Write a protein that binds this ligand. Structure first.
Ligand SMILES: CC(=O)c1cccc(N[C@H]2[C@H](N)[C@@](NC(=O)N(C)C)([C@H](C)O)[C@@](C)(O)[C@@]2(O)COC(=O)c2c(C)cccc2O)c1
Ligand SMILES: [K+]
Ligand SMILES: [Mg+2]
Ligand SMILES: [Mg+2]
Ligand SMILES: [Mg+2]
Ligand SMILES: [Mg+2]
Ligand SMILES: [Mg+2]
Ligand SMILES: [Mg+2]
Ligand SMILES: [Mg+2]
Ligand SMILES: [Mg+2]
Ligand SMILES: [Mg+2]
Ligand SMILES: [Mg+2]
Ligand SMILES: [Mg+2]
Ligand SMILES: [Mg+2]
Ligand SMILES: [Mg+2]
Ligand SMILES: [Mg+2]
Ligand SMILES: [Mg+2]
Ligand SMILES: [Mg+2]
Ligand SMILES: [Mg+2]
Ligand SMILES: [Mg+2]
Ligand SMILES: [Mg+2]
Ligand SMILES: [Mg+2]
Ligand SMILES: [Mg+2]
Ligand SMILES: [Mg+2]
Ligand SMILES: [Mg+2]
Ligand SMILES: [Mg+2]
Ligand SMILES: [Mg+2]
Ligand SMILES: [Mg+2]
Ligand SMILES: [Mg+2]
Ligand SMILES: [Mg+2]
Ligand SMILES: [Mg+2]
Ligand SMILES: [Mg+2]
Ligand SMILES: [Mg+2]
Ligand SMILES: [Mg+2]
Ligand SMILES: [Mg+2]
Ligand SMILES: [Mg+2]
Ligand SMILES: [Mg+2]
Ligand SMILES: [Mg+2]
Ligand SMILES: [Mg+2]
Ligand SMILES: [Mg+2]
Ligand SMILES: [Mg+2]
Ligand SMILES: [Mg+2]
Ligand SMILES: [Mg+2]
Ligand SMILES: [Mg+2]
Ligand SMILES: [Mg+2]
Ligand SMILES: [Mg+2]
Ligand SMILES: [Mg+2]
Ligand SMILES: [Mg+2]
Ligand SMILES: [Mg+2]
Ligand SMILES: [Mg+2]
Ligand SMILES: [Mg+2]
Ligand SMILES: [Mg+2]
Ligand SMILES: [Mg+2]
Ligand SMILES: [Mg+2]
Ligand SMILES: [Mg+2]
Ligand SMILES: [Mg+2]
Ligand SMILES: [Mg+2]
Ligand SMILES: [Mg+2]
Ligand SMILES: [Mg+2]
Ligand SMILES: [Mg+2]
Ligand SMILES: [Mg+2]
Ligand SMILES: [Mg+2]
Ligand SMILES: [Mg+2]
Ligand SMILES: [Mg+2]
Ligand SMILES: [Mg+2]
Ligand SMILES: [Mg+2]
Ligand SMILES: [Mg+2]
Ligand SMILES: [Mg+2]
Ligand SMILES: [Mg+2]
Ligand SMILES: [Mg+2]
Ligand SMILES: [Mg+2]
Ligand SMILES: [Mg+2]
Ligand SMILES: [Mg+2]
Ligand SMILES: [Mg+2]
Ligand SMILES: [Mg+2]
Ligand SMILES: [Mg+2]
Ligand SMILES: [Mg+2]
Ligand SMILES: [Mg+2]
Ligand SMILES: [Mg+2]
Ligand SMILES: [Mg+2]
Ligand SMILES: [Mg+2]
Ligand SMILES: [Mg+2]
Ligand SMILES: [Mg+2]
Ligand SMILES: [Mg+2]
Ligand SMILES: [Mg+2]
Ligand SMILES: [Mg+2]
Ligand SMILES: [Mg+2]
Ligand SMILES: [Mg+2]
Ligand SMILES: [Mg+2]
Ligand SMILES: [Mg+2]
Ligand SMILES: [Mg+2]
Ligand SMILES: [Mg+2]
Ligand SMILES: [Mg+2]
Ligand SMILES: [Mg+2]
Ligand SMILES: [Mg+2]
Ligand SMILES: [Mg+2]
Ligand SMILES: [Mg+2]
Ligand SMILES: [Mg+2]
Ligand SMILES: [Mg+2]
Ligand SMILES: [Mg+2]
Ligand SMILES: [Mg+2]
Ligand SMILES: [Mg+2]
Ligand SMILES: [Mg+2]
Ligand SMILES: [Mg+2]
Ligand SMILES: [Mg+2]
Ligand SMILES: [Mg+2]
Ligand SMILES: [Mg+2]
Ligand SMILES: [Mg+2]
Ligand SMILES: [Mg+2]
Ligand SMILES: [Mg+2]
Ligand SMILES: [Mg+2]
Ligand SMILES: [Mg+2]
Ligand SMILES: [Mg+2]
Ligand SMILES: [Mg+2]
Ligand SMILES: [Mg+2]
Ligand SMILES: [Mg+2]
Ligand SMILES: [Mg+2]
Ligand SMILES: [Mg+2]
Ligand SMILES: [Mg+2]
Ligand SMILES: [Mg+2]
Ligand SMILES: [Mg+2]
Ligand SMILES: [Mg+2]
Ligand SMILES: [Mg+2]
Ligand SMILES: [Mg+2]
Ligand SMILES: [Mg+2]
Ligand SMILES: [Mg+2]
Ligand SMILES: [Mg+2]
Ligand SMILES: [Mg+2]
Ligand SMILES: [Mg+2]
Ligand SMILES: [Mg+2]
Ligand SMILES: [Mg+2]
Ligand SMILES: [Mg+2]
Ligand SMILES: [Mg+2]
Ligand SMILES: [Mg+2]
Ligand SMILES: [Mg+2]
Ligand SMILES: [Mg+2]
Ligand SMILES: [Mg+2]
Ligand SMILES: [Mg+2]
Ligand SMILES: [Mg+2]
Ligand SMILES: [Mg+2]
Ligand SMILES: [Mg+2]
Ligand SMILES: [Mg+2]
Ligand SMILES: [Mg+2]
Ligand SMILES: [Mg+2]
Ligand SMILES: [Mg+2]
Ligand SMILES: [Mg+2]
Ligand SMILES: [Mg+2]
Ligand SMILES: [Mg+2]
Ligand SMILES: [Mg+2]
Ligand SMILES: [Mg+2]
Ligand SMILES: [Mg+2]
Ligand SMILES: [Mg+2]
Ligand SMILES: [Mg+2]
Ligand SMILES: [Mg+2]
Ligand SMILES: [Mg+2]
Ligand SMILES: [Mg+2]
Ligand SMILES: [Mg+2]
Ligand SMILES: [Mg+2]
Ligand SMILES: [Mg+2]
Ligand SMILES: [Mg+2]
Ligand SMILES: [Mg+2]
Ligand SMILES: [Mg+2]
Ligand SMILES: [Mg+2]
Ligand SMILES: [Mg+2]
Ligand SMILES: [Mg+2]
Ligand SMILES: [Mg+2]
Ligand SMILES: [Mg+2]
Ligand SMILES: [Mg+2]
Ligand SMILES: [Mg+2]
Ligand SMILES: [Mg+2]
Ligand SMILES: [Mg+2]
Ligand SMILES: [Mg+2]
Ligand SMILES: [Mg+2]
Ligand SMILES: [Mg+2]
Ligand SMILES: [Mg+2]
Ligand SMILES: [Mg+2]
Ligand SMILES: [Mg+2]
Ligand SMILES: [Mg+2]
Ligand SMILES: [Mg+2]
Ligand SMILES: [Mg+2]
Ligand SMILES: [Mg+2]
Ligand SMILES: [Mg+2]
Ligand SMILES: [Mg+2]
Ligand SMILES: [Mg+2]
Ligand SMILES: [Mg+2]
Ligand SMILES: [Mg+2]
Ligand SMILES: [Mg+2]
Ligand SMILES: [Mg+2]
Ligand SMILES: [Mg+2]
Ligand SMILES: [Mg+2]
Ligand SMILES: [Mg+2]
Ligand SMILES: [Mg+2]
Ligand SMILES: [Mg+2]
Ligand SMILES: [Mg+2]
Ligand SMILES: [Mg+2]
Ligand SMILES: [Mg+2]
Ligand SMILES: [Mg+2]
Ligand SMILES: [Mg+2]
Ligand SMILES: [Mg+2]
Ligand SMILES: [Mg+2]
Ligand SMILES: [Mg+2]
Ligand SMILES: [Mg+2]
Ligand SMILES: [Mg+2]
Ligand SMILES: [Mg+2]
Ligand SMILES: [Mg+2]
Ligand SMILES: [Mg+2]
Ligand SMILES: [Mg+2]
Ligand SMILES: [Mg+2]
Ligand SMILES: [Mg+2]
Ligand SMILES: [Mg+2]
Ligand SMILES: [Mg+2]
Ligand SMILES: [Mg+2]
Ligand SMILES: [Mg+2]
Ligand SMILES: [Mg+2]
Ligand SMILES: [Mg+2]
Ligand SMILES: [Mg+2]
Ligand SMILES: [Mg+2]
Ligand SMILES: [Mg+2]
Ligand SMILES: [Mg+2]
Ligand SMILES: [Mg+2]
Ligand SMILES: [Mg+2]
Lengths: 48, 275
RNA sequence: UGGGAGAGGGUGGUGGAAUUCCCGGAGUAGCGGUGAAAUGCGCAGAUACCGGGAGGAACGCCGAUGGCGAAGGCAGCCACCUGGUCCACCCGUGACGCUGAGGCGCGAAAGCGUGGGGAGCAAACCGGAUUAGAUACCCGGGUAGUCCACGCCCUAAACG
RNA sequence: CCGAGGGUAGGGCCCGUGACUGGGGCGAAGUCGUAACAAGGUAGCUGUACCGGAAGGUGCGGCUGGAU
RNA sequence: GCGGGGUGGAGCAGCCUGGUAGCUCGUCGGGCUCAUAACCCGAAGGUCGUCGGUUCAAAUCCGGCCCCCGCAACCA
RNA sequence: GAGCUAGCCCUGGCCAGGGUGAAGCUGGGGUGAGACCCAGUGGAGGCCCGAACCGGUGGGGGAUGCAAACCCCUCGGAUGA
RNA sequence: GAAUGCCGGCAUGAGUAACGAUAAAGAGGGUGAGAAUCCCUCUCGCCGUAAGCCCAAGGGUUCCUACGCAAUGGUCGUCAGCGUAGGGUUAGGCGGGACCUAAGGUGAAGCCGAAAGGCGUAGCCGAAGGGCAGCCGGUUAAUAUUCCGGCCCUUCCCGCAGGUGCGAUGGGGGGACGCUCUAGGCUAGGGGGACCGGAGCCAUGGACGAGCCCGGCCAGAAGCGCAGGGUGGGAGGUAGGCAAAUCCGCCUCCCAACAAGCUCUGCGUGGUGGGGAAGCCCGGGUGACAACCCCCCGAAGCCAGGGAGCCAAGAAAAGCCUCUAAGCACAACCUGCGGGAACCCGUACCGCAAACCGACACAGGUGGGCGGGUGCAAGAGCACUCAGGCGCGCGGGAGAACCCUCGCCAAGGAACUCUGCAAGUUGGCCCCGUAACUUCGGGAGAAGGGGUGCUCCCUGGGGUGAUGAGCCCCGGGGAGCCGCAGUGAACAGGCUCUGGCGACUGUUUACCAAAAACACAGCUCUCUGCGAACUCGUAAGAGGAGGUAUAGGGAGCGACGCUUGCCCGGUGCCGGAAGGUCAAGGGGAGGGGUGCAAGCCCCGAACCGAAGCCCCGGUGAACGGCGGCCGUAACUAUAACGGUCCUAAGGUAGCGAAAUUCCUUGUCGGGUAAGUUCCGACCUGCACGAAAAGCGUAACGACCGGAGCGCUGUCUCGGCGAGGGACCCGGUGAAAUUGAACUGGCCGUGAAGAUGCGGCCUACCCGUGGCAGGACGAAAAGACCCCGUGGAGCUUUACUGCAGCC
RNA sequence: CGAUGUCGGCUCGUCGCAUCCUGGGGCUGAAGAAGGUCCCAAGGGUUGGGCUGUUCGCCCAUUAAAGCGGCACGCGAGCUG
C-alpha cells in the first residue's frame, strides 16, 4: 500500500534545507549542534 | 418569484431556485471585477476561526459603489441588472453620463433604462441617494451609511429596508431591518426604496450538495461529539444537554446577551430589536 | 341616442376619534374589578391630568322600516379601472326566446399552506371567584386567530 | 392450424369467516350530573374550531324558529 | 441487604421536643323542604399494629415479633 | 515533523459505453381570455445499469505471510457532498 | 550461575518448513573445467486498455563493450541491474532559467511583541497555469526534435531603404477563463478493394484462380483551395479612466450589417526530401525504377477565444495593440531587406517496476498520453489474436492421508445452521406483459413469459456519393436446415410477501464495528446595529466579510405529513436607578506611641460608597419535572362518580410485552405437523410519550428481524475426479522454543491434576508418514479482579487557582 | 494472575450404574392382555424434526426405548464463535 516515504526533491530542500535552517532560531541551533558534533552533513542530501 | 421542480429525483422534490427574471446581463464588467480570495474560514495564522467553511464555487468580486456622494449631481442611466454571487441582493450596472461605470445594489422595482442620481437635491425616487436629513420622514430606504462618509453599512441584504421615523437635531431616527430604533446622522447617505430580490428568503436549498456549493461545509452537533471537544460531548447513548446549553467554547447559548454594555453607540440606540 | 340613483366590485392613496404601548412633564395612596370580592396593577411612584411619539384595527353623527348586488355580502374620504340596473325618446335588428341534466365561476364565519402584520378582542390555556362539584356562567391575564398578500377549503337557521 | 381442457404466473369483482375493535338499536323500577322545553334560571338554534367524565362549554360568524 | 410507615369508619396531623390525641369527610339526633340532596344547629366514636423494657408518667424514647410500602442486589 | 494521514487554499487532469426522458420550446385541442390536455422537439438529475477510477459488504485463503492489513470470489459509489 | 541481565560465540529444532503468484514447458545445436538454468534454432504456452510503447516523479551509472564468477542472485550459472576496466549523455526552436503572475512565502513604508520574534500595502520570490521560434528522415555498440540531411523559423545587434509624432514601469484594450449538452467541416486512427507493386506458393481429396500470402505512405515554406475563429466604419461633443491623451468610456449623427472587407488559425494541395513489406539469403543484402491509387467508417483530437442551455455565476500578470508625459524630434519607433550575434542547466539508463515507495530481484502502492484487429446490441467490458513482451531465478519423480482451488453427482431438497453461512439458481439484447401502495416522479428489470443460430427468396428507409453503382448503417416479410442445446464459448440480476430503524445520495472507528452512528436539506430557540457577535493571537493583526438582520455566530431537532399538552417552587438566562448586603477609596466620632513642646507617628466608630449576591418579576423547541390512599352502579366484575392527603404541576394527543416489559416463552389470534423468534391484537407501560421530539410515511438501504417460491453437496451422506502442495530423489536451507534428560500405564501419595515419589503393571534398540489427549505444551512479567497514600483521560453545585468577562 | 482460554454446539469417544429399552426374576389390590413395585443385569441399543445462542425445557411425528451422570460443567496446539 501507499507507504510514508514519498520522496520529493523540492519538498526535501525546502523543509530540511540549509536555507530553511538558517531562517529560524531553532534551525540555527541544529546547524550549531551538528557542527559541534562533527557531522559530515549538516543538511539532508538532495540533488537540487 | 421562486421556481419549483418536479420530483424526478429525491432532491428536486423540494429544491427551489430564484427566477432570475430581473436579470438582463449575464457576464460582468471586466473593469469592475477582481478575484475574491477564498479563506476557508482560516485567518492569517492559518487557523480556522470560523468553523465549517470552504470548497464553494469560485467567485469574482464585483466592486460596489457604497459611497454615492462620490458623484453628486451627475446622473446615470441603469444599463443592466446582473447576478452577484457575493451578496443576496442583485446588482445594477450604472452608466454615468460621465462615461464612468459603477455597480450599486439594485433596489426593488428599479428599472433598467431609468435614470438615477445622488445629492441633496435629488428627487425622492427609487435609486436616488440623499443625506438622510433631506429624505422625507416616512420613506423606506436602504444602503444607509452609519456615519458620514464611512460607507453604506445598513440594509444591504435582499428585501431589506430601514424606514425614516422622524428627525431630532443633526440625527434622524431609523427603523432598521432588525426592528431596532436608531439615531443615524443626517449627513449619512441612503438610497430610497427597499432592496430587491425579496423572494430570496423563500429559496429551498433542497439538498446537502447545495450547501456545499455555497462554501458551507457540514455543521456537527455538540451532542454528537466527545467531552474533549464540547460541553455537550459524551454520554452513554443519546443525552440531553445536562447543563445549560453551551457553545464549543463554554459560554451559554440560549439567552446570554453578548453586546458590550459600555459601548459608546448605546447613546444612539433608542430601542433594542424586534421579535 | 340622451340621462339617473346607488355601502355593487377591484386597485392606489388618505383623514379624524378611541384603545394599547413608549417618552417628557406635573402629582400621591390607591387603582381596577364585582352580587360582594379576590386574583391583578401600585411608594421600584400606579390610577386621574397635560404634552410628544409609535402602531394596528374599526369608521361615530349622517343612518333610516334606507340604498346596491344573483347570492354570499357591501358603510370615513379621495382618485382611477369595472359590473349591474332604471327612466325617457320609439330610431335600428326582426322571435334572435324561456328554462337548463352535466360543465364552469362565485360562495359568511371558522379552518388550512407560505410569507407578513399584531393595537384591541379572544377559542385553547392559567389564575381569582361562585358552587356539593363548576373542566361553565362572573373577574384578572392570555396563545392561535381576528388584519394584509397569494393559494386552498366549499360548509351554514348560505332563510322569504 | 384451430381446439375441450390441464398446468404455470398475475390481476379484478363478490360471498363467507376472523383475535380484536368502532359506534348503533333495544331492553319495568342501576350510577353521575341537569344540556333542552317557561329569559328553563347564561335566550335557543346553527356551520366551524378548540376543550371537557357526561350531557355540554367557549370563540367567530349567522338565523328568529327569541326577546316582552 | 438499607429507608420510611401502622393512631375514631375513610384519608391525614400529633412522634422529632414524654404529661396535653387534632383536621376534612363519614356516621348519629334535630332543623329547612311537599320530599331527597345541598345547607344550618347539636352529638357520639380512637387509649394509638403487638409483646418486652426506660420512666412518677409512653401513640411519643429504646428493643424484639407481625406485617405495609419503597430503594438496592454491582466486577466477572 | 502535515513527503503518512485530516481540513482548507492555488493551479491542472480524469470519469468507456448504454438507459430513463424534467423544465422549456413548437404545434394541435381548449376557453371570453385562461388553467390545462395531447404530440413532437428537447436533454435536466447529490437519476439508473456498468468499465477506468474511488471503495471495502459477506465469505474463503493467508497467519515464523507474497504482504507489520495481502490474495481470490462476491459487493458499494461511479456528473458528484 | 541465575537479574525474560549485557556483549559475543556456538548449539537445538533439522537435513525439517521453505525456495515468493498453478502463464508451461520440450528438443537439437553451440560454449565451457563444469550447463535443467548462458547463447542460437525449431516446437509449445502466457499478456495484448498489457505483462506492449511514450512522458513526468523518484532513482543516480544501474546504459554500451571487453574481461571475470569469491560474494550478491532464495537452486545452478559459463549469465546478470554483481566484480574490474574502457566507452557513452552534443539543442537559439524540447524542458527550465536570462519573461509573467496564483495560493502562499518574503517584505522598503509602517504596526506590535521582555529577548528570541510576530505581523504588514507596494515591491520581490513562487508553476504542471500565461507566454514563447522545428518538423520528417538518416546515423552509433551506446545520444539524438540535440549530430547529419532536407525543408522552415525566433530574438538580439548593426547597416540600407521606405513610412510615422516618436516616446512608459503610467492610461486603455486584450490576454481572460464555469458546468452540461452540442453544429458544421477536418485530421488522427481503422475497415475493404475484382485496382497498382511483390519474392514466391499449389501440398493431403480439390483449386493455376477475379487464388494464397505481403505491401499500397511520411514531412513539406510561399501560393491557392476548403472550413472556421477574431473584428464594424465615419464624424461632433466630452466634466469619467487620481497628470496628459487623437486612446478607452458616455451622448448624438451618417453608413452598413446570418454577409462583406481586413486579419488569425486548422486542414488539403504544394517546389523538394524521405520512407518503402512479405519472402529468400548472410542486424545487413535482396525484393525494388517497389507500388504508393479508389471506396467506406471516423474521434473524446483540430478549426476554438464556435454554438445553445443552465446557476452554484466560473484567477492573475506579462508578452501584444492603442494612448499620450517627461523627453526627443541629426534622435526614436513601425514595415521591408541584408550581414552579424545567440549564454547557463538537463538530456545516459530503469520508470505499474528486479533500477521508484515498501529492510528483500517483496503477488502491495505509483500521476499523464498512445493503446491495433475480429465477434459478441454498445464499450476502455469479454474471448481470441497483431505489433511488441513474456513463461514469473530451484528442479526431477511419485499419484497416500490431509489441506487448498476447482468439476460432477443417484433419490431427497434447508431435513444443514445462530443464520440458506457458503454454493446453486437467475443472468445480455428484442418483444409481450406487469400488483398493493404512492409524495404521482415512482414502486419497474416489479412479477411472469415468448424470442435469440444457419440458409434461400421478397422488400422498406437512412449515410456517402450524384439523383445511380459500390461501400456503410437501421429494419420488414415468406419459406427452409441442423443439433441435447443457437447471448451454443467468455463477460452479464435469483425472486416475492411482511416488520424494525434511518427519509433520501453521501460520511465514519487507516489496520477487528459501515451501522440504527455522523452529515444532510428543513424546523425552532438564542446571540449579533457593524470597529457586529463570535473565533485565533500577550499584542499588532487577522478570520467573520471587502458580508450588514432575506446577514453572520451558537444550540437542539433532522425530508414530508398530522402534531407537539400541563408545571416558573429549585438551576439557568432575561427585565427591575427601590430596599438589603457589599471591596478599595472617601469620612475621622474617639483613642494610642513618642517628644519639653511645636510636631512626627499608629489604630480607628457612624455615615457616603460598584459589580456580584439577596429580593421582585418574566421565561420551556431553557436545565428539568409531570402523585398517593380509600370508597362507589339492582348478578358478579369493573368503576363514568365521590372522599382525603400531597405537589411547582400531577403524563394531554398518539403509541405500547416495544432496538423500551422485570415476572415472560404474558394472553389471544395468524402463520407451522410442531413457532422462547415473527406478524396482528389486548393493556397493572417493573421502567413509552411529544424537537435528548411523538405517531405515521411513498422512495431509498452491501443495515437487523420473520415467511414463501425458485435452486442447490448446506444436509440425510457421502462418492469420484482435476490441478497446487503434502510424499520420494538432487540443490539451497530457516524459526519460535530449549535447566539438564537415560522423558511408559494404572492406583495412590505429594503445594490439593506426577515420565521424575510409592506399590504394582507393562516395556528389545533406532527411525519414517500421520493424529493431536498430555508435557497444567509455545506466545504475551493477566488487558478481568484486587493492592500501590502509582499514573493518565474525562466530569462536576469537590478544593484551590488561572485565562476571559463584569 | 512472568496466563490453568471462559457457555453452547459439531466431531470423536470412553467410563459409572442410582437401568430408559432389550434379557432373567420375586411380590402384586397379578383372570388374560397390559401395568405397578422391588431384585439381578452395563452386552448392545437409546430416532428425525419446530422454537430458542441456549444447556434445559415445551411441542410435532415416530420408537423396543427416546436413561441419568463422570471424564478440567470431557474434547477451541480438533472445528465453530
Ligand atoms: C348576593 C349574590 O348575588 C350572591 C351571593 C352569594 C353568591 C353569589 N354567587 C354569584 C356568582 N358570583 C356568579 N355571578 C356573578 O358573579 N355575577 C356578577 C352575576 C358567578 C361568578 O357567575 C353566580 C352565577 O354564581 C352568582 O351570580 C349566583 O349565585 C347566587 O346568586 C347565589 C348563591 C349561589 C347562593 C346564595 C345566594 C346567591 O345569590 C351571588
Ligand atoms: K470487568
Ligand atoms: Mg504522492
Ligand atoms: Mg516539484
Ligand atoms: Mg514540494
Ligand atoms: Mg530551504
Ligand atoms: Mg569530511
Ligand atoms: Mg539538518
Ligand atoms: Mg421543487
Ligand atoms: Mg433576478
Ligand atoms: Mg480587471
Ligand atoms: Mg499570511
Ligand atoms: Mg506563519
Ligand atoms: Mg468559529
Ligand atoms: Mg472553516
Ligand atoms: Mg445576486
Ligand atoms: Mg457558492
Ligand atoms: Mg449537524
Ligand atoms: Mg456524543
Ligand atoms: Mg461520539
Ligand atoms: Mg484534542
Ligand atoms: Mg468540558
Ligand atoms: Mg452531556
Ligand atoms: Mg453520546
Ligand atoms: Mg440512555
Ligand atoms: Mg445526560
Ligand atoms: Mg440536567
Ligand atoms: Mg453550561
Ligand atoms: Mg464572550
Ligand atoms: Mg437591537
Ligand atoms: Mg421610595
Ligand atoms: Mg322602431
Ligand atoms: Mg369561502
Ligand atoms: Mg376567514
Ligand atoms: Mg377546518
Ligand atoms: Mg382563520
Ligand atoms: Mg348548587
Ligand atoms: Mg372533585
Ligand atoms: Mg395575540
Ligand atoms: Mg386432460
Ligand atoms: Mg337546564
Ligand atoms: Mg345552554
Ligand atoms: Mg343552569
Ligand atoms: Mg339556557
Ligand atoms: Mg374526571
Ligand atoms: Mg372552556
Ligand atoms: Mg437485614
Ligand atoms: Mg413530628
Ligand atoms: Mg433525636
Ligand atoms: Mg411532645
Ligand atoms: Mg301530594
Ligand atoms: Mg409504660
Ligand atoms: Mg399519653
Ligand atoms: Mg462497574
Ligand atoms: Mg504530499
Ligand atoms: Mg484516461
Ligand atoms: Mg422522446
Ligand atoms: Mg393553438
Ligand atoms: Mg447518478
Ligand atoms: Mg475484503
Ligand atoms: Mg482501501
Ligand atoms: Mg459469498
Ligand atoms: Mg494479520
Ligand atoms: Mg485482493
Ligand atoms: Mg473479483
Ligand atoms: Mg457491483
Ligand atoms: Mg453504478
Ligand atoms: Mg457513468
Ligand atoms: Mg465538484
Ligand atoms: Mg546465586
Ligand atoms: Mg532469552
Ligand atoms: Mg541440523
Ligand atoms: Mg529427508
Ligand atoms: Mg519437524
Ligand atoms: Mg517442501
Ligand atoms: Mg511462498
Ligand atoms: Mg546451466
Ligand atoms: Mg554449470
Ligand atoms: Mg537463449
Ligand atoms: Mg485488443
Ligand atoms: Mg484480451
Ligand atoms: Mg536507491
Ligand atoms: Mg558468483
Ligand atoms: Mg565456479
Ligand atoms: Mg557460483
Ligand atoms: Mg548468493
Ligand atoms: Mg548461488
Ligand atoms: Mg530471493
Ligand atoms: Mg568462463
Ligand atoms: Mg552509454
Ligand atoms: Mg538547432
Ligand atoms: Mg545576458
Ligand atoms: Mg521569472
Ligand atoms: Mg514577478
Ligand atoms: Mg521602520
Ligand atoms: Mg519569477
Ligand atoms: Mg519562493
Ligand atoms: Mg511556466
Ligand atoms: Mg487559466
Ligand atoms: Mg519553450
Ligand atoms: Mg516546423
Ligand atoms: Mg561507434
Ligand atoms: Mg504614438
Ligand atoms: Mg502601454
Ligand atoms: Mg474574467
Ligand atoms: Mg496529417
Ligand atoms: Mg473498421
Ligand atoms: Mg509470381
Ligand atoms: Mg475629457
Ligand atoms: Mg486625465
Ligand atoms: Mg528496405
Ligand atoms: Mg536498388
Ligand atoms: Mg463560447
Ligand atoms: Mg448548473
Ligand atoms: Mg516637453
Ligand atoms: Mg535633431
Ligand atoms: Mg507607424
Ligand atoms: Mg548570462
Ligand atoms: Mg537523450
Ligand atoms: Mg526492469
Ligand atoms: Mg524473482
Ligand atoms: Mg513487485
Ligand atoms: Mg483507442
Ligand atoms: Mg457486447
Ligand atoms: Mg514458469
Ligand atoms: Mg519462482
Ligand atoms: Mg508419492
Ligand atoms: Mg444431488
Ligand atoms: Mg424446496
Ligand atoms: Mg423443489
Ligand atoms: Mg429455515
Ligand atoms: Mg435469519
Ligand atoms: Mg450461478
Ligand atoms: Mg451469464
Ligand atoms: Mg400485490
Ligand atoms: Mg402512480
Ligand atoms: Mg424479466
Ligand atoms: Mg450452424
Ligand atoms: Mg445485473
Ligand atoms: Mg420486533
Ligand atoms: Mg441512512
Ligand atoms: Mg444512519
Ligand atoms: Mg425516524
Ligand atoms: Mg433526514
Ligand atoms: Mg451516489
Ligand atoms: Mg475499522
Ligand atoms: Mg480500530
Ligand atoms: Mg491502529
Ligand atoms: Mg473493528
Ligand atoms: Mg473486517
Ligand atoms: Mg468500513
Ligand atoms: Mg453501507
Ligand atoms: Mg460515525
Ligand atoms: Mg423540519
Ligand atoms: Mg488566546
Ligand atoms: Mg484572546
Ligand atoms: Mg476583507
Ligand atoms: Mg456576513
Ligand atoms: Mg448559523
Ligand atoms: Mg443527524
Ligand atoms: Mg420551572
Ligand atoms: Mg419564577
Ligand atoms: Mg425559573
Ligand atoms: Mg474606608
Ligand atoms: Mg393536560
Ligand atoms: Mg404491552
Ligand atoms: Mg411478543
Ligand atoms: Mg409474546
Ligand atoms: Mg421501558
Ligand atoms: Mg418479556
Ligand atoms: Mg414475551
Ligand atoms: Mg426476558
Ligand atoms: Mg409461547
Ligand atoms: Mg394456528
Ligand atoms: Mg433474536
Ligand atoms: Mg406485535
Ligand atoms: Mg396486563
Ligand atoms: Mg423515548
Ligand atoms: Mg431534551
Ligand atoms: Mg414509528
Ligand atoms: Mg415506509
Ligand atoms: Mg402520504
Ligand atoms: Mg442506506
Ligand atoms: Mg446499508
Ligand atoms: Mg461436501
Ligand atoms: Mg491432485
Ligand atoms: Mg535459532
Ligand atoms: Mg541424562
Ligand atoms: Mg486429595
Ligand atoms: Mg496422581
Ligand atoms: Mg525425581
Ligand atoms: Mg522416596
Ligand atoms: Mg518411581
Ligand atoms: Mg514405582
Ligand atoms: Mg499396565
Ligand atoms: Mg498433543
Ligand atoms: Mg495439552
Ligand atoms: Mg501473542
Ligand atoms: Mg502480573
Ligand atoms: Mg500483560
Ligand atoms: Mg490516600
Ligand atoms: Mg499505604
Ligand atoms: Mg509503582
Ligand atoms: Mg494518584
Ligand atoms: Mg490525573
Ligand atoms: Mg490466574
Ligand atoms: Mg513465561
Ligand atoms: Mg493464569
Ligand atoms: Mg504464558
Ligand atoms: Mg385384570
Ligand atoms: Mg447395558
Ligand atoms: Mg433447545
Ligand atoms: Mg429454558
Ligand atoms: Mg414396551
Ligand atoms: Mg460444575
Ligand atoms: Mg468444558
Ligand atoms: Mg471446551
Ligand atoms: Mg480456537
Ligand atoms: Mg468451545
Ligand atoms: Mg491448546
Ligand atoms: Mg493444550
Amino acid at each position: 500500500m501507499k507507504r510514508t516515504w514519498q520522496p520529493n526533491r523540492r519538498k526535501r530542500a525546502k523543509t530540511h534545507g540549509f536555507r530553511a535552517r538558517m531562517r529560524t532560531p531553532g534551525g540555527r541551533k541544529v546547524l550549531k549542534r551538528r557542527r559541534q558534533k562533527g557531522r559530515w552533513r549538516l543538511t539532508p542530501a538532495v540533488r537540487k | 418569484a421562486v421556481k419549483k421542480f418536479k420530483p424526478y429525483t429525491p432532491s428536486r422534490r423540494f429544491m427551489t431556485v430564484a427566477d432570475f427574471s430581473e436579470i438582463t446581463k449575464t457576464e460582468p464588467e471586466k473593469s469592475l471585477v477582481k478575484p475574491l480570495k477564498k479563506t476557508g474560514g482560516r485567518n492569517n495564522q492559518g487557523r480556522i476561526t470560523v468553523r465549517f467553511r470552504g470548497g464553494g464555487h469560485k467567485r469574482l468580486y464585483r466592486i460596489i459603489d457604497f459611497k454615492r456622494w462620490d458623484k453628486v449631481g451627475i446622473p446615470a442611466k441603469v444599463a443592466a441588472i446582473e447576478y452577484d454571487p457575493n451578496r443576496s441582493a442583485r446588482i445594477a450596472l450604472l452608466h454615468y453620463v460621465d462615461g464612468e461605470k459603477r455597480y450599486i445594489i439594485a433596489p426593488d422595482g428599479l428599472q433598467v433604462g431609468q435614470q438615477v442620481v445622488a445629492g441633496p437635491d435629488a428627487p425622492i425616487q427609487v435609486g436616488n441617494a440623499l443625506p438622510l436629513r433631506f429624505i422625507p420622514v416616512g420613506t423606506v430606504v436602504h444602503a444607509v451609511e452609519l456615519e458620514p462618509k464611512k460607507g453604506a453599512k445598513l440594509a444591504r441584504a435582499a428585501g431589506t429596508s430601514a424606514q425614516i421615523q422622524g428627525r431630532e437635531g443633526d440625527y434622524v431616527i431609523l427603523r432598521l431591518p432588525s426592528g431596532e430604533l436608531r439615531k443615524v446622522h443626517g449627513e449619512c447617505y441612503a438610497t430610497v426604496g427597499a432592496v430587491g430580490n425579496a423572494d430570496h428568503k423563500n429559496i429551498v436549498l433542497g439538498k446537502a450538495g447545495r450547501s456545499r456549493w455555497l462554501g458551507r461545509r457540514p455543521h456537527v452537533r455538540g451532542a454528537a461529539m466527545n467531552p474533549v471537544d464540547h460541553p455537550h460531548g459524551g454520554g452513554e447513548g443519546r443525552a440531553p444537554r445536562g447543563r445549560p446549553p453551551a457553545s464549543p467554547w463554554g459560554w451559554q447559548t440560549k439567552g446570554l446577551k453578548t453586546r458590550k454594555r459600555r459601548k459608546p453607540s448605546s447613546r444612539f440606540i433608542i430601542a433594542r430589536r424586534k421579535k
